Design a protein around this ligand. Structure first.
Ligand SMILES: *C(=O)CCCCCCCCCCCCC
Ligand SMILES: *C(=O)CCCCCCCCCCCCC
Ligand SMILES: *C(=O)CCCCCCCCCCCCC
Ligand SMILES: *C(=O)CCCCCCCCCCCCC
Ligand SMILES: *C(=O)CCCCCCCCCCCCC
Lengths: 115, 115, 115, 115, 115
């Protein structure tokens, strides 16, 4: 059943199409997904949350006060999970800037009805 | 990313613990997802819809008028798709009969707000 | 009682005396029923529906929407189910057209009491 | 009858100039027509309807109930028949996208008889 | 798509059952279609008009006010087009006279709606 993720136009096929910068050439690779698990394990957060959008969103919500002064690894991890949230929301983001704008669109859409 | 799904509590931890026959000593295995994938391909239906609860539920909606007249293979597929729906919904069902109770429970629940 | 499978003047004796095409001199065989089971098995329908009128009505209801554009084999199965219905009701019909007229007349009577 | 279908200036001559993508490298070939006739007999649809526009439209209707959750091959078959319908209607489409627009675009006139 | 015309029950198969004489024995043949194409080229007439009823109707309309003077060949062409017209409406006529009546018969209703 996990095979759905490797079908043409599925989530792992969609992931390695996404560009790092909005006009750049180098792409996102799946190695960043594996890398994320060990960082979550280090700080004692459950990697099982990266299975769905709803799980990814809990991680993204947690790190919001830390993020502003965060290291380059922490900000990059936040951007890496941001893309997993966008991919799990079925959004065909072409790059990081779009994924970040898509999160602001998701947060604006979410927050407006949840004050 | 499919590592997350096999961590305990994930979808492919839950899938293989569920009983086939309520007093039976046999449980559902991954072999029945490939069998469902073959039978859906034989019916010219997309097996990628098995990723999600809504895609499984759409397949359950599609095959419902054919169940009254359905074969052992069709009823067995309906039960296979039903358990995948229960797994995607994170419902801790122990067997086929609990999974069937949940579809009937959800359908009667659904009827009340569909009027 | 398997002895009833050779019943003289029964339904099986009549089956072999019913004409396939209405002016044609050639009759229905029991291997047609075996072929009908195999065609039903491909479309995932339960063969036991052949054995009762209650199942035959459901088969016809499911075949009718596809009849008009359906292939000759679909039409011949429709006619085969129609004759089995006439046989289960114990309606003597000499041929396929006679069976079709009797079943449409019985169905027409049913649809006046179906609302 | 319609032997004109394989002559210069005819339906095939036009068929093989229709592109897959507006400026695309590949075009449609005659052998898709032969394959489609074989596929229809598997579903048990009559292969004699294919020489007529309204028979082709009726076949497209018949393919709809599994199209929506349908496999890639079923969608490809439907779109290929759709382009052929446009060819039988003597519509000189530029490409695959136009054949898709023509179905909705022609139906807009007649769908205003149902508003 | 053209195979349908040669599959049993198709338009060529219907063509070939039609009598050349009202209560006759001899019928129309594929080699008459070849002959008809040869007669058309002699007067520089497009064959693509004999694909449909409307094209045939237009040719009959051109032929009609010249028939009184016409040769046995002109009458034969008129009869032949008329038979094709009836075939293209898919009317299983027994003979050439019936096909001719169908044209005058359409005029009894159509010309009365033309004024
Ligand atoms: C999701 O698609 C299931 C994960 C796969 C485990 C291996 C399956 C091997 C199947 C072999 C064929 C069994 C007969 C249907
Ligand atoms: C996402 O996590 C990428 C993972 C790439 C390696 C997968 C290795 C196999 C994981 C499933 C093992 C299941 C054992 C029962
Ligand atoms: C009598 O013993 C009751 C149980 C009957 C079981 C089924 C017997 C089927 C015999 C052959 C039927 C052939 C019909 C074409
Ligand atoms: C009526 O005029 C029908 C023609 C149908 C003939 C079908 C069999 C021969 C194949 C014809 C097409 C070949 C294209 C390469
Ligand atoms: C509508 O039905 C179009 C039918 C086209 C028939 C084409 C048949 C081609 C046969 C090729 C045989 C091999 C030649 C090397």
């Amino acid at each position: 059943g996990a095979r759905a993720s490797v079908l043409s136009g599925g989530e792992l096929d969609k992931w390695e199409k996404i560009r790092k910068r909005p006009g750049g050439k180098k792409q996102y690779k799946l190695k960043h997904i594996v890398w994320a698990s060990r960082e979550l394990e280090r700080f004692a957060v459950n990697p099982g949350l990266l299975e769905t959008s709803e799980g990814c969103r809990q991680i993204l919500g947690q790190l919001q006060p830390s993020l502003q002064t965060g290291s380059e690894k922490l900000r990059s991890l936040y951007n890496t999970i941001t893309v997993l949230y966008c991919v799990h929301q079925r959004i065909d983001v072409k790059d990081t800037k779009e994924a970040l704008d898509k999160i602001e669109e998701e947060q604006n859409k979410s927050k407006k009805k949840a004050q």
